[PDB]
Design a binder for these strands. Structure first.
Lengths: 44, 30, 98, 181, 141
RNA sequence: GCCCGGAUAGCUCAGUCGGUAGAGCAGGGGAUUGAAAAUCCCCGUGUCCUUGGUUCGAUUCCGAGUCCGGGCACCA
RNA sequence: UGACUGGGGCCUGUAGAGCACUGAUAGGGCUAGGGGGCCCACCAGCCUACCAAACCCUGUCAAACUCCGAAGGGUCCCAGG
RNA sequence: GGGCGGUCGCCUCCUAAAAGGUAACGGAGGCGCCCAAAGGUCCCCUCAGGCGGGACGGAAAUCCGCCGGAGAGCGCAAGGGUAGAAGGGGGCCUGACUGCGAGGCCUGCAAGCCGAGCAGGGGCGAAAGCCGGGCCUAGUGAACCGGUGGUCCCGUGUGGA
RNA sequence: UCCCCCGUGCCCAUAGCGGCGUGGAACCACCCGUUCCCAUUCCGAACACGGAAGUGAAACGCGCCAGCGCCGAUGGUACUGGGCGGGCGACCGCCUGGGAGAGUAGGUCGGUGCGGGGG
């Protein structure tokens, strides 16, 4: 499944792939942005 | 813990296990 | 076997090898490629105490004073079957860090 | 609990009788016990919701040591389960705990075996060390009559430093292993 | 007939015939043998006609050794078809035979009958033959 | 992609314009008759999908998640 | 500096050969099963110029097998040219 | 010859004549995905088979003892590679980073591939260090036209739209 | 310089498997314990810690052995850069530079650096 990753409380994206049935729902994961250096990022 | 086994054939064997109170009908003596 | 040989994971020079025997504890600084020891020290085989972990530090500090004297600064830590624990040479001086 | 009958009455009797019987050179050249390892196995990771560490603690009573679960590798599609997730159930007894179990086993268990006559003679049959198995769990002393959901068995294996199964055949019969020769 | 009972692949290439035999060039099983002079592929039905003839001749006889195997498959396209459309079907099996290979052997029969039975075989075979005895065929050390 | 309807007994479906959880069929026990049916009495069965919230409490009332079902468009 | 040639150093899996791997293979030995005679159904028992695994000996086969392996070819350096 | 049939991109082996490359409606197989752990790091552990020996237990359910350098395993085809781990088990994690990138492989074009190193801010480790997804080689689609979310930009006399 | 043992590299089986002797003063190991640091899908088995009553049994070191394993000429062929033939063709022969693989005679139970401790 196609997927996009937002810098909780602003812009940004990263974009990945989840597997719904196989471990998915409410994907969250720690990552760096050019905007305000690391930041915890969620699905969309 | 240490323990006593009490046979129906009189005899008393003294080993260890858990729970010390043991009624047995017959050990190695019949 | 204890294959192990993480010592194989040595790239970028100067090996501080350690030997732990049932009675004793020894160590030699080696420059490979050349194939040659430069500096050393040992347990009571260096003439010393009958303890264990205290003894370790002592041989450690020993190795330190001798190395810096030759112009050797920094290295990399060994023990094959290490399990980095107990008998450690957590010594000042040598620049291998930690 | 640091010294039992089988312990003592091994060093102070069975020990010398074998240095005589066979004429050894070393205290290490004589046969000793290494280890005793029991296995249940069963195969009850099925339906009706299968708990059965319930029956792994009743095994921990008789032995005193807590057992580890052992898992599966292939798949008997012929008679159910696969992959992993299973039932096999095991415990390794070394020293003291070793003799304590063997103690009560020889004094109280094999006696309690419904008919009985003696252990089978050649379950060494060559490869040093010995093996036996059981049907019942209640021939054991510390396990009660009214706490049984269902009787079950086990596979007791006893290891030795001795090379040939002569050297061993001796050592066990001397500690009191009843044999149906 | 006389074919392999399993093969990695069902069809294979054609290949050339260099001289020599590489191996198979000394008798080593019976008393009298049959050696080849011309290179050829020898079909199974030839080998057979050769075998049955051997036995036919000296009925209730000795032992025959067929020291060669039809391991190689033979492709041929159906009649009156054009080219391409991929390789043919496999229609039989053959054995590669080059100059010096000892093809056949007999043992435990009168020199008289050996000489004869081997000669009849060569009449079943699409090549030139020669008969041989038991001379310096001693590759021991 | 966008706009409608819905989930309640094994199956298929009716509900207070917030305070009750109800039908038919199937299944089951009996009445029955030449056989098979059609009569006739009798009972079984619930997290109302779903987590939240309004509320004196909620199956119903509202945010939201989920799957089954329709309707209308676009495709470089 | 060129083609070509002399002297060096790497790289390579063909011709040829081989059977260690993958498969194929003729005969004999050794030996699980199965067929079948002796025979008893209480299940054992002995034999068989039957079919026959695995394993060993002798003899071989292979584009998509290789324990091995040339002549040559590729490239870089120094020269003649 | 054309039709009927078959095929059309991509990967692996052979044909291929010991660098590379190399044809035929030549021989034989696979891809159009998957993994929120099947990824990072640190610390551990070693196979398949075979012959013994063991209650229920087949001819490998799980147990024990010898022998067994790899024939097992690595999500799926084949090949190469691999236990001095790329394989099996746990703990902490998210580098399945942002900004670039000397230098090369490959090559008609345009594409495809490998990449040390510096800056930033991190993960695991005592350190040495390693990390810019996955043992490796298939899991793919130029431009054009549109959709959504942002941002220094433009905004038809000027401000805004 | 000459022995022995402990660490650690280079050679990549002529160092290997199996047999048979040895070695404990010193090294080394096994051994004694499980309070303590640290451990076990259960086990102080392993890792780990404090010890020294005992043993060289196991493990390791050192010898000696050729049964298996490993290495392996010299000759002579196979094949072949280049030059030239015979035949009507599958294929065969000469000249000149290069030259296997199998198999034979035979070789092998290692060699060799750096550093420690002991006479």
């Amino acid at each position: 499944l196609l997927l996009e990753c937002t810098e909780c409380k602003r812009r940004n994206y990263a974009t990945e792939k989840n597997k719904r049935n196989t471990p998915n729902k409410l994907e969250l994961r720690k990552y760096c942005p050019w905007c305000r250096k690391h930041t915890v990022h969620r699905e969309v | 813990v240490p323990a006593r086994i009490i046979c129906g054939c009189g005899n008393v064997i003294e080993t260890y296990s858990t729970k010390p109170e043991i009624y047995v009908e017959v050990c190695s003596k019949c | 076997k204890f294959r192990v040989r993480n010592r194989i994971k040595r790239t970028g020079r100067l090996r501080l090898s350690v030997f732990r025997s049932l009675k004793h504890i020894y160590a030699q600084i080696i420059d490979d490629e050349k194939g040659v020891t430069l500096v050393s020290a040992s347990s009571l085989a260096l003439k010393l105490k009958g303890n264990k972990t205290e003894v370790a530090r002592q041989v450690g500090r020993a190795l330190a004073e001798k190395a810096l004297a030759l112009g050797i600064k920094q290295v990399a830590f060994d023990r094959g079957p290490y399990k980095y624990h107990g008998r450690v040479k957590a010594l000042a001086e040598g620049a291998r860090e930690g | 609990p640091l010294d039992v009958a089988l312990k003592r009455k091994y060093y102070e009797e069975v020990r010398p009788e074998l240095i005589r019987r066979f004429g050894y050179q070393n205290v290490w050249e004589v046969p000793r016990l290494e280890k005793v390892v029991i296995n249940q196995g069963l195969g009850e990771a099925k339906e009706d919701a299968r708990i059965l560490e319930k029956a792994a603690q009743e095994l921990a009573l008789i032995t005193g040591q807590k057992p580890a679960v052992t898992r599966a590798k292939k798949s008997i599609s012929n008679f159910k389960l696969r992959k992993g997730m299973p039932i096999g159930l095991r415990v390794t007894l070394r020293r003291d705990r070793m003799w304590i179990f063997l103690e009560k086993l020889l004094n109280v268990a094999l006696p309690r075996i419904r008919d009985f006559r003696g252990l089978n003679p050649n379950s060494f049959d060559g490869r040093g060390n010995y093996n036996l198995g059981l049907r019942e769990q209640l021939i054991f002393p510390e396990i009660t009559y009214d706490m049984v959901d269902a009787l079950r068995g086990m596979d007791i294996a006893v290891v030795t430093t001795a090379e040939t199964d002569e050297e061993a055949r001796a050592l066990l019969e001397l500690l009191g292993f009843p044999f149906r020769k | 007939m006389l074919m392999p009972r399993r093969m990695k692949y069902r069809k294979q290439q054609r290949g050339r015939l260099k001289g020599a035999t590489k191996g198979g060039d000394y008798v080593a099983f019976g008393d009298y043998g049959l050696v080849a002079l011309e290179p050829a592929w020898i079909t199974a039905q030839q080998i057979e006609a050769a075998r049955v003839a051997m036995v036919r001749h000296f009925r209730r006889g000795g032992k025959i050794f067929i020291r060669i195997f039809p391991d190689k498959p033979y492709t041929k396209k159906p009649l009156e078809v054009r080219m391409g459309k991929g390789k043919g079907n496999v229609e039989g099996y053959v054995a590669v035979v080059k100059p010096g290979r000892v093809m056949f052997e007999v043992a435990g029969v009168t020199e008289e009958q050996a000489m004869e039975a081997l000669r009849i075989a060569g009449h079943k075979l699409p090549i030139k033959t020669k008969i041989v005895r038991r001379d310096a065929y001693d590759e021991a050390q």
